[PDB]
């Protein structure tokens, strides 16, 4: 981290990185695929 | 919004005709920008000469206001 | 057509420029006069018929124009003439709201000079009919709006002559 | 913005643990207290108009000279900016009442107060006297725990200005 | 230290390096730079 | 021409709104086809024959006002009704009036007219049903599909 | 503008403006200075915006910038950000006009045909615009950010 | 940091006015449901270890590549880092749930996280999945706990889900 | 309304509402309570407003109420004020709708033909409406009086 | 068509009544929800295409419907079906803005049941396509607007069945 | 319009001549190249879009033409330009099938030079767009058809200049 | 850090030379005018608070949006930051004025400043204006002070202006 090349030293790096926004991939529908996932009522019962 | 003013001469190639018909063959009239074009085709696809086309309403440069 | 605002946008678009300080100053000069334009339009619209009647009375009728041999002789042609008058008034009101005369060229002046030559319609007499409606308008709309309404009537009348 | 919930959440984050009982217990307090707070808030909200005009005037009645020419309680703009400023204070008091902490006051009025007042030649005494008056009248708009809440925050501003 | 980083960096730039040299991390937030810069304005360099 | 487009009942009420259009026609600036087209693009048309009906009866009403008949087959409803869904009324009207069929049948001047067509199957009776209903008598779609 | 739109509807029905039409011109013009401020802020940060949109885009779609991608390479990427600069500009125009007339004639009517020819994936251009919304919106007050956001979502809508 | 009240306050201030009786009652309702909220946060805290453990067992059941050499949850050091991240995210989700606002989650945890993982070579899709599993089990616990008064917690279960779903979306 | 007008234009061009159209709905709805207050005040003084319009009318045109006048007599005058009551009502409707759709279908389209049949002098009905503007406007604040005034001048305009 | 506001005006007009307290309360109940309707429309419009794609994916495709013998077999019919879907979405957005379902009757439902019977278009399958778009919409628009958007999708679907 | 078979008939009809040996030789010279014309048209038609894309890429875009101030700036005008390109390609394919340029005069060139002068459309740039499509076409259609396709592109381009 | 002499020296050294008789006398003149320079720097120091205050009053008189909610000099915290920046810039301008060289101003104050403000959402055009107002008042004081010997300070007033103008240009 040194200034000898100009002498002045660089402009702050993080100003633009610091302010990048949230961002709203909104809506969004999830995915079950993936592999086929069980559905049915039997799931509890088999277990029982 | 823009308008073209065009002159067309279309003859009758099937049938002759029998009653005055003079405005139905050689006419001039204002036509809109959106069609003037697909009417440019109907006229030339019916074997008609198109004699002259003038802009009338809009500005040659465009960009804005044209779309109205 | 274009108004004050789209006049500026299209002038910059052809240069692909974002709006700069000079542009922003022009648009302000329009917005800052906007409320006054609206009030003036409401006066003209609601007095439309009276403006035509007072303008015709000062500049057209009681004359050779309305007598046999005159172009506004016959109820047909008298009707056509004051019909025209209503167009002028109405469009000038559009131009003044828009703060741009481009609509007066696109939808009113284009070909009109020759149309009038072809029918025999007296041009000089029509201009007086325009400048009489301006006179009436300038009284009705008041100090606020008088100069701004007036210019588009003057645009119309130097468009024919 | 400093509030009960925010503070406890921050504590948890710093400790990098989990919302345990201590935290939950503390948070309940803030929830249980909301009713009194929010009653104070509604009363201060609808009386705002008059609370502000009352306090503005009282600044001139306690500092008569302010309203003479060449002074800072003279002309429409000073007197306008004054009403506004007391209105800012009452606004943040209601916010602090609704929020469950001093955060809104700390972030929007306390941080920087003295530097600003010193550059602009604004005496805290006026503002204390505006608030002392607002405190007098709020004595009869509220009572019980809503009054205690209103008082807590008015006094907080007076202490902040001092 | 003074010469090398504070003297020729803006405040923003200067503040980034103290986080690097002193705490071994980047400033987590935009507010974090606000606090430091401000403290510089009232208390001066040494306090900062 | 207000009785062909607009249809009789509502053409009785027209007084003078289209009067700038009439001047142009009178003065030979536009042909009868331009006048007809322009009176289909007007708000009165749109209000009367488009805003209160489902998009497939809009095509049917328009067929009978600018062309004379009813939709001939199904490869049409599909063509013209999917140009109204896509672009609104002015493209639907603009298309009918610039077709080959309109040009053959009506040409430059000739106000459009009701033709009782003979061919394709069912075109005649479908059309005659449409033709003999006064405005608002029945608003079912005759040719749903 | 709002003016052009109101008038065109007026003239087409051969009439003076409605009370409604007059009201919207009045409300619109009252927001003039605010709308001008919204355009200024965004004009002032254009280079930053176009860039943060471009990062957000290439994370979400590293493929566009991949062997068989429309924006693959340094100068196929340079033109891509230039197009993002174009659309931000049009968005500032729209905000000061109070409608899309200008935005539309300049950059959506014909855009399907243009990009289909160039074989540019349209829906990833729509993503680049969402990315710009996110950046631009973080430089504006809540109220101004919403007002701006409508015009971003329009462009996103028209590329569809 | 924001909570649901603080959020209201910031939006009000940007208008330069006081509460819009609208916002007041929205917040009165949050106070109304706050005992349920405390139970919901308590459900997560009281089962944090099992929620992480069970999510974990299942993540590696599905993705046996992560625990092979070459895999991002191999050797012990990396597995401990992965288990630690599962805890960190579950932590900030519980904070958001006490707060009634996602901001603490987005600002301290999710902001930059995806780009961290990509720099590291950590497969973000696997991390997203681990978050989906934590969600399933966490909500399980929110819905079926020790002698809590019987009522309807679906509003809170949804809200908790959106915090899990924010994190997943942000990371994948 | 403003809503109906915006939507009808939207549907007719097969599209979602414009930023402009959305903006005017927003500005319109913000003026809701104010517009409702303007209608209330005028509804509350309806009987007075007709009585003062009716006096202003008969001074300016004593002939209408004269041997060969359409409104000559006690019950030809009673119906005349009832018509003035009708139009004030429609004006309150217009103000709360923010445009004329309702005013128009109910009382201007067909009005020439109706009154021509009854042989009522149309331009003196327009005067009766100006007279109502004058009275109603004196019961409203400057800002609300203007907003009301646009709808009075519309009716005056349509009878023309 | 009619909206909330014109629904009230026409209900009073037929009685020739000036708007009274009950009327004024109804109109307030509309105006007070207005800003939220606008925001919701902007979300739907700008996510239009994604809503259709997610709704088709959950309720139409990967099925016998898209296979030979199915009504959305052929690119022609697949295109017609998602074209329809766009109509529904778009009009429901109009109904929700207007706060009145009357437009859904006038311009969408009238004759549609029989049109679908005549072409063979499966009604039950179309309803699922409507109720899947509702599901997606209700996520995207949020607490503020979810219930209000939802009802006009439910209006559409009980209009077919 | 006319084609090689038709032109031979009308050229003789005006002289009232039976088709004689010279005529019959001309018609043979057309028929004998006919199968090759058909194959060439099927290549052009099915590569239409790619030919325009490659022709624009070599002769129009990446230039001042597509930049602000340029005639193919704006999506509107870019669309109009490649629309035109498709006309040229399509009609040249007709001319080459017919073995007669008369259709290029009747339905494409007549008035087009002045139309372009009136709009400001750059003629020289349009010719390069024509001669670039020819270049692509001549590769795709092969030895059999290259010279025959080429001439009607050259007819088009000397029709503008 | 450079001053006007140090600058001379650096340029001489880059030639490998002892200072030119040209450069020598340019520096002899700076020593000639140095009492005036000290008064000029003293004019600013002695009225720093008022220069900032008066610039401020006038900035917000012109731009009443900054002090509304939504505005960048609202609430107290932001106004204090803005007042602080006015002081910081006036301070480095006075340093440059003692030095006879802009470098301290460019290197510790102006370098990166614009990009800071843009990151923050601080309207740079307003900041530029605040600097223009400080200039007007500062020079006012340089020109009309307490019992300083009468003479011509226009050379120094110009030079001070260029430092104010550098800052403005750099920021806007
Ligand atoms: C040959 C076709 C033709 C006709 C009929 C015609 C009528 C006509 N009547 C006029 C005025 C007038 N006409 C009348 C007529 C009447 N007042 C009444 O109350 C009665 C109902 C009616 C008498 C039976 C009056 C009073 C005026 C003056 C109106 C004014 O100056 O405002 C004028 C304007 C004055 C002028 O410049 O001449 C014209 C042109 N012009 C024509 O070219
Ligand atoms: C968000 C919280 C917040 C607070 C509290 C606030 C205070 C504040 N008061 C100010 C001015 C002022 N404040 C007052 C106050 C008063 N004048 C009188 O008549 C009375 C004596 C007194 C009221 C008790 C006056 C006169 C000014 C104008 C000072 C000037 O510019 O000369 C200014 C300078 C900017 C401006 O001119 O508006 C600030 C920042 N600003 C904020 O943003
Ligand atoms: C929308 C813009 C627009 C305008 C302005 C317009 C003018 C216009 N005026 C016309 C005729 C006319 N214009 C007038 C005008 C006048 N007579 C006089 O003596 C006076 C000097 C003057 C009135 C002040 C008359 C008398 C005619 C009828 C000529 C004839 O008998 O054919 C015609 C011929 C068609 C027709 O008769 O309607 C047009 C098109 N048309 C348009 O589309
Ligand atoms: C503006 C209001 C409006 C609506 C809603 C409308 C619907 C409508 N859907 C149609 C056909 C159709 N509609 C569908 C719809 C579907 N196929 C399926 O399997 C699914 C269950 C469903 C989509 C979810 C299909 C496949 C056809 C084509 C039937 C045919 O091949 O003829 C047709 C016949 C004309 C045409 O093909 O375009 C109309 C008019 N028309 C209108 O004007
Ligand atoms: C130490 C911090 C702290 C906690 C944790 C706390 C919990 C707490 N939960 C309560 C109620 C409750 N809690 C629940 C929660 C649930 N109901 C279900 O069926 C679900 C399985 C579960 C969903 C989260 C319900 C339904 C009630 C009764 C309704 C209510 O009071 O809102 C009550 C009211 C008294 C009661 O009815 O038991 C308290 C005090 N109070 C506190 O001070
Ligand atoms: C017989 C007329 C006919 C065709 C052609 C047809 C295609 C068709 N392709 C589909 C999906 C698909 N088609 C592809 C095809 C491709 N992906 C690529 O990148 C390549 C360019 C291309 C392979 C060459 C893919 C990847 C999907 C899955 C898209 C998704 O699920 O979102 C689907 C939806 C899945 C289903 O329900 O079947 C249909 C209906 N349907 C028809 O009725
Ligand atoms: C103001 C209205 C307007 C627009 C928008 C416009 C766009 C435009 N984009 C172009 C190319 C391009 N545009 C892109 C853009 C992208 N690549 C991707 O994969 C992404 C989806 C996207 C960036 C977000 C790329 C990669 C090219 C180069 C394509 C090529 O050279 O084949 C070109 C051809 C190069 C040129 O001559 O300038 C034009 C004209 N022109 C206009 O007049
Ligand atoms: C069926 C035979 C036929 C042809 C060929 C035809 C050409 C034609 N090109 C036009 C415009 C145009 N033509 C171009 C063409 C170009 N721009 C450039 O910069 C390039 C040099 C060039 C493409 C290679 C452009 C940009 C316009 C739009 C001018 C305007 O903005 O008004 C127009 C005006 C109407 C319209 O805009 O559609 C016509 C009629 N019309 C026809 O009926
Ligand atoms: C190197 C010397 C240096 C400069 C120049 C500097 C500028 C600077 N100004 C800042 C903020 C600020 N600057 C202003 C300034 C203004 N607001 C307005 O509306 C006016 C147009 C303008 C005053 C004329 C405001 C209001 C903020 C706070 C923004 C916020 O937090 O919302 C910040 C963010 C950190 C903080 O708030 O302390 C920096 C770094 N920092 C430095 O270290
Ligand atoms: C403690 C640090 C320090 C200071 C401040 C200092 C000032 C100082 N200023 C001086 C002169 C002066 N100073 C000025 C300054 C001005 N003339 C004007 O009319 C302007 C308003 C103002 C412009 C800046 C002038 C004109 C002279 C006399 C000429 C000269 O000596 O150069 C002198 C020479 C003695 C005298 O003539 O009074 C001294 C010692 N000496 C020091 O050691």
Q: Which domains does chain H have, with CATH numbers?
A: 1-172 (1.10.490.20)
Q: What is the distance in angstroms between the CA of the first residue and the CA of the last residue of chain F? A: 29
CB G64 within 8 A of CB G72: yes
Our separate counts of H helices and E strands in chain C read 8, 0
Distances (CA, A) of B30 to B5, F30, F32, H21: 4, 6, 12, 60
Q: Does G117 reach chain K within 8 Å, measured CB to CB?
A: yes
- CA separation for the pair K6, K14 (Å, rounded): 13
Tell how far the Cα of J103 is from the centroid of ligand 4, in angstroms: 19
Question: Any known ligand binding at H82?
Answer: yes
CB-based contacts of H42: which residues, under 8 Å, 6+ apart?
Answer: D19, D24
CA-based radius of gyration for chain A? 27
D122/L contact by beta carbon, under 8 A? no
Rg (CA), chain H: 18
Pick from J46, J83, J93 the residue to mutate for testing the G interface (most G CBs within 10 Å).
Answer: J46
Domain ranges for chain C: 1-161
Question: Which pair of structure tokens corresponds to residue G29?
Answer: 């013009």
Q: Is G153 on the interface with J (CB under 8 A)?
A: yes
3-class secondary-structure state, position D3? coil
Using a CB-CB cut-off of 8 Å, the residues of chain K touching C17 are 68
Nearest to B1 among C1, C9, C13 (CB): C1
**Residue-wise burial string across C9-19, b where 16 or more C-beta atoms lie within 10 A, e elsewhere:** bbbbbbeeebb
**Residues sharing a CB contact under 8 Å with residue L105, sequence separation 6 or more, in sequence order:** L92, L93, L95, L96, L163, L166, L167
**Bridge partner residues of B32 (DSSP):** B3
Single out the residue of D116, F75, C105, H157 nearest to residue L76, CA to CA: D116
- And the tokens for K26? 């001309």
Please report which residue ranges of H17-47 form alpha helices under DSSP H: 22-32, 34-45
Nearest one of D161, D139, D28, D37 to D93, comparing CA atoms: D37
Q: How close are the terminal C-alpha atoms of chain L, in Å?
A: 25
Closest CA to C56 of C91, C27, C21, C80: C80
Q: Inter-chain contact H114–G142, Cβ cutoff 8 Å?
A: no
Q: Please classify residue D29 by burial: count the beta carbons closer than 10 Å to its beta carbon, then call 0-12 exposed, 13-18 middle and 19+ buried.
A: exposed
CATH of domain G1-160: 1.10.490.20
**Which residue of L34, L38, L149, L150 sits with most ligand 10 atoms within 8 Å of its CB, as the best mutation to test the pocket?**
L149
CA J110 to chain centroid: 14
Ligand at minimal distance from the CA of D73 is 2
Is there a binding annotation on residue C62? yes
Residue D79 CA to ligand 2 center (angstroms) comes to 10
> CB atoms < 10 A from the CB of K71, how many?
20
K83 among annotated binding-site residues: no
List Cα–Cα distances, K97 to A29, C42, E27, G48, K145, in angstroms.
54, 64, 72, 55, 11
**Nearest to residue I65, comparing CAs of I124, I114, I112, I131?**
I124
Which structural technique was applied? cryo-EM
Q: How far apart are CA L132 and CA L155, in angstroms?
A: 19
Which residue, L138, L90, L42, is CA-closest to E41?
A: L90
Pocket test for ligand 10, best of L30, L36, L154 (most atoms within 8 A of CB): L36
Question: What spacing in Å lies between the alpha carbon of C74 and ligand 1's midpoint?
Answer: 12
C-alpha distances in angstroms, F120 versus F71, F74, F80, F100, F141?
A: 10, 12, 18, 17, 19
Q: How far apart are CA J148 and CA H23, in angstroms?
A: 19
K116 is in an annotated binding site: no
Residues in contact with ligand 6 (CB, 6 Å cut-off): J 61-62, 66, 73-75
In angstroms, the CA H1 to CA D9 distance is 9
DSSP element (H, E) containing F20: helix F20-26
CA distance C108 to C102: 10
Look at ligand 4, atom 32, and give the residue with the nearest C-alpha: J119
Contact call for residues H95 and H104 (beta carbons, < 8 A): yes
Distance CA C127, CA C132 (A): 9
Helices and strands (H, E) in chain D, number of each type? 8, 0
Collect all residues of chain E within an 8 Å Cβ-Cβ radius of residue A4: none
G104 and B67 within 8 Å at the Cβ level: the answer is: yes
Cβ-defined contact of K75 to G118 (cutoff 8 Å): no
Contact (CB, 8 A) for K32 and K65: no
The residue assigned the tokens 């140009």 is F83
| Cross-strand bridge partners of residue D102 | none
Smallest CA-to-CA distance from G94 within I17, I15, C18 is with C18
Ligand closest to CA J72: 4
Tally DSSP H helices, then E strands, for chain F. Answer: 9, 0
The residues, ordered by sequence, that sit 6+ positions from J133 with a Cβ below 8 Å of its Cβ are J51, J52, J55, J85, J88, J89, J153
CA-CA distance, K11 to K26, in Å (whole number)?
12
Sheet holding B26-32, edge to edge: B26-32, B3-9, B49-54
What distance in Å separates the CA atoms of residue L160 and residue L45, rounded to the nearest whole number? 13
* Rounded-to-integer distance, Cα C93 and Cα C99, Å: 10
Burial of D15 (0-12, 13-18, 19+ CB in 10 A): exposed
Distance J80 CA to ligand 4 centre (A): 5
As a residue count, chain J comes to 161
Read out DSSP for G30-87? HTHHHHHHHHHHHHHTHHHHHHHHHHHHHHH-TTTTSTT-TT-SHHHHHHHHHHHHHH
G83 is in an annotated binding site: yes
Contact residues, chain F to chain B, C-beta under 8 Å: 24, 28-31, 34, 94, 98-100, 103, 107-110
Whether residue C80 has its Cβ less than 6 Å from ligand 3: yes
K148: how many CB neighbours lie within 10 A of its CB? Answer: 17
Task: Please indicate if any CB of chain L lies within 8 Å of the CB of A6.
Answer: no
Inter-CA distances, L31 with C133, D104, L43, L101, Å: 77, 55, 19, 14
Contact F113, F4 (CB under 8 A): yes
- Omega before I30 cis (within 30°)? no
Q: Which of I103, I94, I88 is nearest to I45 (CA)?
A: I88
For residue L156, the ligand closest to its alpha carbon is 10
| Burial group, residue K56, by CB count within 10 angstroms (0-12, 13-18, 19+) | buried
Task: Burial-class residue A32 by CB neighbours within 10 Å (0-12, 13-18, 19+).
Answer: exposed
Cα–Cα distance between K89 and K137 in angstroms, integer?
A: 9
CB I42 within 8 A of CB I136: yes
Q: How far is the CA of I18 from the centre of ligand 7 (A)?
A: 26
Contact D98 H24 (CB under 8 A): yes
Chains I and D touch (3+ CB pairs under 8 A): no
Q: Which residue is associated with the tokens 């207000």?
A: F2
Phi-psi region of G99 (alpha: psi -120 to 50; beta: other; left: phi over 0): beta
Closest by CA to H37, choosing from F119, K141, D9, is D9
For B53, the token pair is: 């086309």
Interface of L with G (CB under 8 A): 65, 70, 118, 121, 123-125
Contacts of B67 in chain G (CB under 8 A): 101, 104-105, 109
Please give, one letter per residue, the 3-state secondary structure of chain J.
CCCHHHHHHHHHHCCCCCCCHHHHHHHHHHHCCHHHHHHHHHHHHHHHHHHHHHHHHHHCCCCHHHCCCCCCCCHHHHHHHHHHHHHHHHHHHHHHHHCCCHHHHHHHHCCHHHHHHHHCCCHHHHHHHHHHHHHHHHHHHCCCCHHHHHHHHHHHHHHHC
CATH number of the domain encompassing residue D60: 1.10.490.20
Task: Provide the residue range defining the domain that includes D150.
Answer: 1-162
Contact between chains at B1 and C13 (C-beta distance less than 8 A): no
Q: Which of C53, C55, C51, C56 is nearest to C66 (CA)?
A: C56
Closest CA to D105 of D86, D120, D91, D125: D91
Q: Any known ligand binding at L134?
A: no
Is residue A7 within 8 A of residue E5, CB to CB? The reply is no
Q: Check if F23 has its Cβ closer than 6 Å to any atom of ligand 3.
A: yes
CB-closest option in F94, F108, F110 to B27? F108
Angle made by CA atoms I141, I146, I152, in degrees to the nearest 5: 120
Residue numbers in F near G12 (CB within 8 A): 42-43
Residues 6+ apart with CB under 8 A from K27: K4, K5, K8, K19
Integer Cα distance of H160 and D19 in angstroms: 15
| Number of separate domains in chain D | 1
User: What kind of fold does domain J1-161 have according to CATH?
Assistant: Globin-like (1.10.490)
CA atoms within 13 A on the CB side of I95: 31
Task: Kindly give the number of the ligand 3 atom that is closest to the alpha carbon of C77.
Answer: 26
Mutual angle of helices I46-60 and I122-137, in 10-degree steps: 130
């Amino acid at each position: 981290d040194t200034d000898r090349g100009i002498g002045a030293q660089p402009a702050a790096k993080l100003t633009f990185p610091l302010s990048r926004p949230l961002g709203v991939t909104s809506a969004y529908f999830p995915s079950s695929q993936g592999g086929a996932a069980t559905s049915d009522g039997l799931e509890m019962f088999t277990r029982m | 919004s823009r308008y073209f003013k065009v002159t067309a001469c279309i003859p009758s190639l099937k049938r002759v005709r029998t009653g005055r018909e003079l405005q139905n063959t050689f006419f001039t009239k204002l036509v809109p920008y959106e069609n003037w074009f697909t009417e440019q085709q109907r006229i030339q696809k019916a074997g008609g000469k198109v004699l002259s086309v003038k802009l009338f309403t809009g500005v040659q440069g465009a960009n804005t206001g044209v779309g109205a | 057509m274009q108004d004050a605002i789209t006049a500026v946008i299209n002038n910059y678009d052809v240069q692909g420029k974002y709006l700069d300080g000079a542009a922003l100053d022009k648009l302000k000069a329009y917005f800052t006069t906007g409320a006054v334009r609206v009030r003036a339009a409401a006066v003209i619209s609601s007095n439309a018929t009276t403006i035509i009647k007072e303008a015709a009375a000062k500049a057209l009728i009681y004359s050779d124009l309305t007598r046999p041999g005159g172009n506004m002789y016959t109820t047909r042609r008298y009707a056509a003439c004051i019909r025209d008058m209503d167009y002028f008034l109405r469009y000038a009101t559009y131009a003044m709201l828009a703060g741009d005369p481009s609509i007066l060229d696109e939808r009113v002046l284009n070909g009109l000079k020759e149309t009038y030559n072809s029918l025999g319609v007296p041009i000089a007499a029509t201009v007086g009919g325009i400048q009489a409606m301006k006179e009436v308008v300038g009284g009705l709309v008041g100090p606020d709006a008088a100069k701004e309404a007036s210019i588009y009537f003057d645009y119309l009348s130097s468009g024919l002559s | 913005m400093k509030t009960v919930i925010t503070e406890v959440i921050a504590s948890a984050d710093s400790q990098g643990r989990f919302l345990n009982n201590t935290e939950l217990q503390a948070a309940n307090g803030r929830f249980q207290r909301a009713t009194a707070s929010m009653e104070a808030a509604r009363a201060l909200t609808s009386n705002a108009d008059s609370l502000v005009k009352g306090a503005v005037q009282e600044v001139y009645n306690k500092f008569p000279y302010l309203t003479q020419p060449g002074q800072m309680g003279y002309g429409d703009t000073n007197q306008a900016k004054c009403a506004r400023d007391i209105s800012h204070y009452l606004r943040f008091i209601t916010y602090s009442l609704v929020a469950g902490g001093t955060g809104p006051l700390d972030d929007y009025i306390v941080a920087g107060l003295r530097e600003v007042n010193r550059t602009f030649n604004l005496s805290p005494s006026w503002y204390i006297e505006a608030l002392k008056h607002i405190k007098g009248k709020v004595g009869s708009q509220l009572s019980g725990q809503p009054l205690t809440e209103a008082n807590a925050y008015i006094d907080y501003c007076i202490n902040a200005l001092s | 230290y003074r010469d090398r980083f504070f003297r020729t960096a803006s405040n923003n730039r200067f503040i980034e390096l103290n986080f690097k040299h002193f705490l071994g991390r980047a400033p987590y937030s935009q507010a974090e730079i606000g606090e430091h810069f401000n403290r510089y304005h009232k208390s001066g360099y040494d306090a900062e | 021409a207000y009785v062909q487009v607009f249809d009789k009942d509502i053409a009785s009420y027209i007084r003078s709104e289209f009067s700038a259009l009439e001047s142009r026609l009178r003065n030979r600036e536009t042909s009868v086809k331009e006048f007809v087209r322009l009176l289909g693009f007007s708000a009165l048309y749109r209000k009367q024959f488009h805003d209160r009906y489902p998009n497939t009866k809009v095509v049917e009403f328009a067929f009978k006002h600018f062309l004379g008949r009813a939709v001939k087959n199904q490869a049409e409803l599909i063509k013209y009704h999917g140009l109204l869904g896509r672009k609104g009324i002015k493209a639907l009207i603009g298309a009918l009036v610039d077709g080959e069929e309109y040009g053959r049948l009506y040409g430059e001047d000739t106000v459009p007219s009701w033709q009782f067509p003979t061919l394709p199957a069912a075109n005649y009776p479908n059309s005659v049903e449409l033709y003999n209903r006064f405005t608002r008598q029945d608003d079912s779609l005759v040719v749903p599909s | 503008s709002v003016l052009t739109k109101a008038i065109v509807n007026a003239d087409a029905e051969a009439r003076y403006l409605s009370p409604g039409e007059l009201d919207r011109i009045k409300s619109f013009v009252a927001s003039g200075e605010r709308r001008l401020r919204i355009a200024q802020t965004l004009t002032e940060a254009r280079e930053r915006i176009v860039k943060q949109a471009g990062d957000q885009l290439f994370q979400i779609r590293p493929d566009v910038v991949s062997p068989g991608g429309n924006a693959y390479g340094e100068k196929m990427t340079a033109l891509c950000l230039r197009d993002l600069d174009y659309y931000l500009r049009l968005v500032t125009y729209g905000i000061v006009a109070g409608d899309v007339t200008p935005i539309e004639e300049i950059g959506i009517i014909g855009v399907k045909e243009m990009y289909n020819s160039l074989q540019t994936p349209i829906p990833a251009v729509a993503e680049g615009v969402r990315a710009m919304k996110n950046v631009a919106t973080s430089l504006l007050s809540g109220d101004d950010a919403a007002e701006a956001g409508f015009y971003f979502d329009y462009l996103v809508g028209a590329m569809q | 940091m924001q909570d649901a009240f603080t959020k209201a306050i910031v939006a009000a201030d940007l208008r330069g006015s006081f509460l819009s009786e609208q916002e007041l009652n929205q917040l009165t309702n949050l106070v109304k449901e706050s005992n349920k909220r405390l139970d919901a946060v308590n459900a997560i805290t009281g089962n944090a270890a099992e929620i992480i453990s069970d999510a974990a067992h299942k993540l590696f059941a599905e993705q046996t590549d992560l625990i092979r050499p070459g895999g991002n949850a191999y050797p012990n050091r990396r597995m401990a880092a992965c288990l630690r991240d599962m805890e960190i995210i579950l932590r900030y989700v519980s904070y958001a749930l006490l707060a009634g606002d996602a901001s603490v989650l987005e600002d301290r945890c999710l902001n930059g996280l995806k780009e961290t993982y990509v720099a590291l070579g950590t497969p973000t899709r696997s991390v997203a999945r681990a978050v989906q599993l934590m969600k399933e089990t966490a909500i399980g616990y929110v819905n079926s706990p020790s002698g809590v008064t019987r009522g309807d917690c679906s509003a809170l279960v949804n809200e908790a889900a959106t915090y899990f779903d924010k994190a997943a979306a942000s990371i994948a």
